Tab-separated table of C-alpha atoms and ligand atoms in Angstrom:
chain	number	residue	atom	x	y	z
A	1	UNK	CA	20.633	-11.116	-30.372
A	2	UNK	CA	19.152	-14.349	-29.053
A	3	UNK	CA	18.272	-13.141	-25.527
A	4	UNK	CA	15.081	-11.267	-26.412
A	5	UNK	CA	13.797	-14.162	-28.525
A	6	UNK	CA	14.523	-17.123	-26.278
A	7	UNK	CA	11.532	-16.324	-24.019
A	8	UNK	CA	9.234	-17.527	-26.809
A	9	UNK	CA	11.016	-20.778	-27.558
A	10	UNK	CA	9.013	-23.944	-26.784
A	11	UNK	CA	11.809	-25.280	-24.538
A	12	UNK	CA	12.225	-22.081	-22.502
A	13	UNK	CA	10.750	-22.113	-19.008
A	14	UNK	CA	10.538	-19.367	-16.348
A	15	UNK	CA	12.207	-21.574	-13.791
A	16	UNK	CA	15.187	-21.178	-11.508
A	17	UNK	CA	17.472	-24.244	-11.246
A	18	UNK	CA	15.507	-25.987	-8.509
A	19	UNK	CA	12.176	-25.549	-10.228
A	20	UNK	CA	13.704	-26.999	-13.349
A	21	UNK	CA	14.883	-30.075	-11.472
A	22	UNK	CA	11.435	-30.548	-10.027
A	23	UNK	CA	9.866	-30.226	-13.439
A	24	UNK	CA	12.271	-32.768	-14.876
A	25	UNK	CA	11.972	-35.318	-12.075
A	26	UNK	CA	9.029	-37.135	-13.668
A	27	UNK	CA	10.406	-36.727	-17.199
A	28	UNK	CA	12.318	-39.138	-19.372
A	29	UNK	CA	16.141	-39.434	-19.219
A	30	UNK	CA	17.717	-36.598	-21.259
A	31	UNK	CA	14.753	-34.249	-21.102
A	32	UNK	CA	15.686	-30.617	-20.546
A	33	UNK	CA	14.690	-26.945	-20.347
A	34	UNK	CA	16.322	-23.620	-21.176
A	35	UNK	CA	16.163	-20.880	-18.511
A	36	UNK	CA	17.593	-17.544	-17.368
A	37	UNK	CA	20.975	-17.533	-15.624
A	38	UNK	CA	22.620	-15.229	-13.053
A	39	UNK	CA	25.900	-15.697	-14.910
A	40	UNK	CA	25.025	-12.584	-16.814
A	41	UNK	CA	22.526	-10.770	-19.046
A	42	UNK	CA	23.896	-12.546	-22.086
A	43	UNK	CA	23.879	-16.005	-20.464
A	44	UNK	CA	21.265	-18.727	-20.252
A	45	UNK	CA	21.312	-22.154	-18.644
A	46	UNK	CA	20.348	-25.608	-19.737
A	47	UNK	CA	19.117	-28.030	-17.039
A	48	UNK	CA	18.809	-31.654	-18.173
A	49	UNK	CA	18.225	-35.001	-16.562
A	50	UNK	CA	21.147	-37.456	-16.592
A	51	UNK	CA	19.350	-40.204	-14.732
A	52	UNK	CA	16.928	-40.675	-11.842
A	53	UNK	CA	17.304	-37.763	-9.548
A	54	UNK	CA	20.511	-36.653	-11.250
A	55	UNK	CA	20.588	-33.340	-13.120
A	56	UNK	CA	23.208	-31.179	-14.901
A	57	UNK	CA	23.130	-27.439	-15.266
A	58	UNK	CA	25.006	-26.146	-18.354
A	59	UNK	CA	26.006	-22.567	-19.164
A	60	UNK	CA	25.156	-20.943	-22.476
A	61	UNK	CA	27.131	-17.779	-23.260
A	62	UNK	CA	26.371	-15.359	-26.086
A	63	UNK	CA	29.291	-13.586	-27.773
A	64	UNK	CA	27.299	-11.211	-35.818
A	65	UNK	CA	26.807	-13.286	-32.633
A	66	UNK	CA	27.209	-16.873	-31.558
A	67	UNK	CA	26.196	-19.005	-28.550
A	68	UNK	CA	28.906	-20.965	-26.749
A	69	UNK	CA	28.044	-24.128	-24.761
A	70	UNK	CA	30.950	-26.148	-23.273
A	71	UNK	CA	33.424	-24.905	-25.875
A	72	UNK	CA	31.032	-25.551	-28.817
A	73	UNK	CA	29.892	-22.564	-30.950
A	74	UNK	CA	26.321	-22.388	-32.213
A	75	UNK	CA	24.803	-19.723	-34.458
A	76	UNK	CA	21.186	-20.333	-33.461
A	77	UNK	CA	19.346	-21.468	-30.329
A	78	UNK	CA	17.511	-24.172	-32.285
A	79	UNK	CA	20.880	-25.837	-32.966
A	80	UNK	CA	21.387	-26.207	-29.209
A	81	UNK	CA	17.872	-27.658	-28.874
A	82	UNK	CA	18.731	-30.127	-31.641
A	83	UNK	CA	21.950	-31.123	-29.799
A	84	UNK	CA	20.215	-31.976	-26.529
A	85	UNK	CA	17.283	-33.736	-28.249
A	86	UNK	CA	19.904	-35.869	-30.172
A	87	UNK	CA	21.542	-36.644	-26.838
A	88	UNK	CA	18.125	-37.612	-25.404
A	89	UNK	CA	17.454	-39.936	-28.370
A	90	UNK	CA	20.777	-41.744	-27.988
A	91	UNK	CA	19.983	-42.420	-24.351
A	92	UNK	CA	16.800	-44.368	-25.297
A	93	UNK	CA	17.043	-48.034	-24.242
B	101	NA	NA1	20.726	-13.292	-16.639
């Protein structure tokens, strides 16, 4: 699946939610990280910065096999990375 390969992705970090928020505090708006999630063995979480000191934690669920994020179905992790980078680009001002 995608679970055993995500640990080597450039945007994957061995952080829990709080550590992710601390990491993103000094980053630009829209920056994010992918991390493990207690929602289950086939889940991951995306933590991204909405604005100064404001973060969002988003569930990624795996279910061959696709990744679901907020109703949207993705076939590869990179597609998700592309989505959040695109979101980050649009927020440039
Ligand atoms: Na897990």
